[PDB]
């Protein structure tokens, strides 16, 4: 095993942590437990604190001259590292082994993330802006002070970033499919269609195959057929909102003639390279500025409730049939998109 570490520029305050990414399983989420180390003389009877924060941020911390931080907090918690509290919140195995290295000059600290919180998600910076862009970012801050309201100088505090991320369930759900009829206003002449997928769950970049079937017992002609994958971001920062964008799509002129039937399979792949410039596309959690997958679809627990506290993102396929002299018809269907449980 191994451990990450971070420390103040004065070197007298140091925080050790077990993992940078934390999994959640809709009934359990790993704690952020670790240890903090301080020089006992330097602290001069200041109290030593750590504070988990989930922040709906905007703008980068690059010290650019931007209009920084619509900085809403979703949740914040506190723990007093020194002077030692009573027993709660007894050390886990990892903290026991950390302390067996570090000795009594280090003190354990602990959190549980409230389960009903988002994953780390970042909205893609538009090229017309500068620096980073908005996204719900976790953070753990450790600092020493006489009071929690104190000015908290940079030498008195240290910052470390973490992610909360979700992985695929061990069993797949039902296959997504849909069907629709477009009968004319009075006559039995009708246009009718079907579509279905391989699976409900896909790994990033793995090709989706969408089946399409069309029944046209009518005089109209289907001129063109579109398949698109649509991404949906349910921003709930202050009042319910939504933003939607197509992340990939394919079109073909394979028309369906009047009084005719047709079927085809379309192979489509969501990927980021050809979406490099689009604003508002939701990307999975970034540590500093790294590239990464399109935001994995975050899934609700068995008990639904409101299901969104910060950013919530999902995908749906939609198929449109373009019809001569008007009368287009479309259908939409969901799927989820995330990495597998790492081995």
């Amino acid at each position, epitope marked *: 095993t*191994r451990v990450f570490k971070k420390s103040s520029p004065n070197g007298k305050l140091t925080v050790y942590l077990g993992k940078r990414d934390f999994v959640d399983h809709l009934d359990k989420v790993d704690p952020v437990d670790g240890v903090v180390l301080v020089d006992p003389d330097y602290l001069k009877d200041r109290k030593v604190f750590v504070t988990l924060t989930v922040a709906f941020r905007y703008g980068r911390e690059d010290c650019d001259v931007l209009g920084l931080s619509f900085r809403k907090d979703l949740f914040i918690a506190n723990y007093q590292a020194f002077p030692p509290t009573p027993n709660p919140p007894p050390p886990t195995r990892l903290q026991e082994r950390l302390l067996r290295k570090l000795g009594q000059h280090a003190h354990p600290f602990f959190f549980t993330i409230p389960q009903n919180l988002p994953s780390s998600v970042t909205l893609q910076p538009g090229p017309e802006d500068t620096g980073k862009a908005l996204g719900v970012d976790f953070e753990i801050r450790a600092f020493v002070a006489k009071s929690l309201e104190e000015k908290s100088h940079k030498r008195n505090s240290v910052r470390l970033v973490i992610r909360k991320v979700q992985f695929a369930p061990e069993k797949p759900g039902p296959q997504p499919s849909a069907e629709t009829t477009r009968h004319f206003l009075m006559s039995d002449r009708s246009l009718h269609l079907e579509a279905s997928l391989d699976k409900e769950l896909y*790994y*990033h*970049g*793995e*090709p989706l195959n969408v089946n399409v079937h069309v029944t046209n017992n009518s005089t109209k002609t289907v001129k063109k057929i579109k398949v698109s994958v649509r991404q949906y971001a349910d921003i709930v920062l202050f009042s319910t909102a939504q933003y939607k964008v197509p992340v990939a799509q394919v079109e073909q002129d394979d028309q369906v003639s009047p009084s005719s039937t047709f079927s085809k399979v379309y192979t489509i*792949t969501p*990927f*980021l*390279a*050809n979406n*490099r410039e689009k604003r508002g596309l939701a990307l999975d959690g970034k540590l500093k500025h790294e*590239d990464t*997958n399109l935001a994995s679809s975050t899934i609700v627990k068995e008990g639904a409730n409101k299901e969104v506290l910060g950013i919530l993102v999902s995908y749906r396929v939609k198929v449109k049939l373009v019809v001569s002299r008007g009368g287009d018809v479309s259908v939409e269907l969901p799927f989820v998109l995330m*990495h597998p449980k790492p081995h």
Partner: antibody
Framework: VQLVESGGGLVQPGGSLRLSCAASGFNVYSSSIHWVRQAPGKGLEWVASISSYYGYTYYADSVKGRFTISADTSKNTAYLQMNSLRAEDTAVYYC?????????????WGQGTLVTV | DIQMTQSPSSLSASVGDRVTITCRASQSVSSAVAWYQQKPGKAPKLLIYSASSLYSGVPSRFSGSRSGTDFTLTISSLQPEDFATYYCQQYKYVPVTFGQGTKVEIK
């Protein structure tokens, strides 16, 4: 699942040649194609790679601008153009697959093909 | 470049023996190390990835572990089909670098 090469053979200095790597059973939007090379009997060296999902490409400094790597995601294959061959570049060349999410070493290896110059 | 060093250049053993091979990083690469096996005239196979985890299908009598900047590949009990040459690499930083390479043989 397999990875297959073609295009090797004979070259004269100052010439140029093109190599191909056809992938069967894995897709080039959740994986990547890497090229590495080995002068006869010597320790192998990394030269070029293409990462389709992000769109980037990378090269070694001994070779930048003079090589070029490319891929087709509908035929699900990769190609690279070796311009202006020289005696220093005569070697066997392998094309190899890597997991994209996330990098875990070159695991499926093409059968290897050679470039005499 | 992240330079790589590997020793000893050649060694020999007998059936069943313990053998050790060392790869030393010129910079503090975290754990992004892998080891490959090359038979003469033929394509590689990967043996160890992420510096500890052995790759699927490999017999467990191969084994590696991290030690600071120095990575050690070992053969727990050598067999009559192991006689080949082995290559180390890092993969934390581009360009990746492959090691000098070492060979293993009977006597």
């Amino acid at each position: 699942v397999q990875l297959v090469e073609s295009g090797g053979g004979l070259v004269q200095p100052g010439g140029s040649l093109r190599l191909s790597c056809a992938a069967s059973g894995f897709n080039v939007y959740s994986s990547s194609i890497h090229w590495v090379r080995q002068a006869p009997g010597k320790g192998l060296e990394w030269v070029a790679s293409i990462s389709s999902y992000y769109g980037y490409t990378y090269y070694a400094d001994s070779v930048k601008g003079r090589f070029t790597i490319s891929a087709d995601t509908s035929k699900n294959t990769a190609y690279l153009q070796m311009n202006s061959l020289r005696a220093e570049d005569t070697a066997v060349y392998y094309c190899a697959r890597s997991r994209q999410f996330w990098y875990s070493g070159l695991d499926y290896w093409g059968q290897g093909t050679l470039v005499t110059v | 470049d992240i330079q790589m060093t590997q020793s000893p250049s050649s060694l020999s053993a007998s059936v069943g023996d313990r053998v050790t091979i060392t790869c030393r990083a010129s910079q503090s690469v975290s754990s992004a190390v892998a080891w490959y096996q090359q038979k003469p005239g033929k394509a590689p196979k990967l043996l160890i990835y992420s510096a500890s985890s052995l790759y699927s299908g490999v017999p467990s009598r191969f084994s590696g572990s991290r030690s600071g900047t120095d990575f050690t590949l070992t053969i727990s009990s050598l067999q009559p089909e192991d006689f080949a040459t082995y290559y180390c690499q890092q993969y934390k930083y581009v360009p990746v670098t492959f090691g000098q390479g070492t060979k293993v043989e009977i006597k």
